[PDB]
Design a protein around this ligand. Structure first.
Ligand SMILES: NC(=O)C1=CN([C@@H]2O[C@H](COP(=O)(O)OP(=O)(O)OC[C@H]3O[C@@H](n4cnc5c(N)ncnc54)[C@H](OP(=O)(O)O)[C@@H]3O)[C@@H](O)[C@H]2O)C=CC1
Ligand SMILES: COc1cc([C@H](C)C#Cc2c(C)nc(N)nc2N)ccc1-c1ccccc1
Length: 157
């Protein structure tokens, strides 16, 4: 399976100055549950924003840098390399990778953050004309989770 995994706001912001614009522990839990024991594929910049691989899953980084080597990280140098990765593979960011992959994925797991944040990086536009809502689950508001959010699972029609 090839899936997108993304959190974006009401205007499809995903990032600002190499960081997530919001703090939402519930969403990190959602990522952990979905991707543990599977594979994440991310662009070089997304990886460096996090700085280290996420535990208990395969971390694959896409870069043109032939010197790129990080312990606990597998490197690929082409989009075509993604299709040869076994198991459930989640496209994990950022903007460039999403733009390259949105047309190709089976599936999207989107956390819609119901706010308008300042951003410099964006998820590409998409229409529900192309995507069936497999599930839509409201995130629970919390002392630690104070932004309304909805977990969408979208499947290509
Ligand atoms: N939610 C998110 O996903 C988050 C993303 N961001 C940010 O996104 C911002 C914008 O950068 P963006 O480019 O979208 O980030 P990406 O994660 O998509 O990384 C881009 C890099 O990935 C590599 N890459 C992408 N496509 C290819 C390809 N076809 N062939 C070879 N290498 C490829 C290149 O690395 P290289 O230059 O090494 O060759 C490229 O510069 C960054 O500032 C990043 O911090 C910030 C916070 C969160
Ligand atoms: C999982 O940890 C992260 C992941 C990222 C990357 C950019 C991501 C992502 C992502 C999230 C958070 N949610 C969903 N649904 N999809 C994603 N691709 C950025 C910062 C962090 C992070 C780093 C340190 C502390 C807290 C969060």
């Amino acid at each position: 399976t090839l899936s997108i995994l993304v959190a974006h706001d009401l205007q499809r912001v995903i990032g600002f100055e190499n960081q997530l614009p919001w703090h939402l522990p519930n969403d990190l839990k959602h990522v952990k549950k979905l991707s543990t024991g599977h594979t994440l594929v991310m662009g070089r910049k997304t990886f460096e924003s996090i700085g280290k691989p996420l535990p208990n899953r395969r971390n694959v980084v896409l870069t043109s840098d032939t010197s790129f080597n990080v312990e606990g990280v597998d490197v690929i140098h082409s989009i075509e390399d993604i299709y040869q990765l076994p198991g459930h593979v989640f496209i994990f960011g950022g903007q460039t990778l999403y733009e390259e992959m949105i047309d190709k994925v089976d599936d999207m797991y989107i956390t819609v953050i119901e706010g308008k944040f300042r951003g410099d990086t964006f998820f590409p536009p998409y229409t529900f004309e192309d995507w069936e809502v497999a599930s839509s689950v409201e995130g629970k508001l919390d002392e630690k989770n104070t932004i309304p959010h909805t977990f969408l699972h979208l499947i290509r029609k």
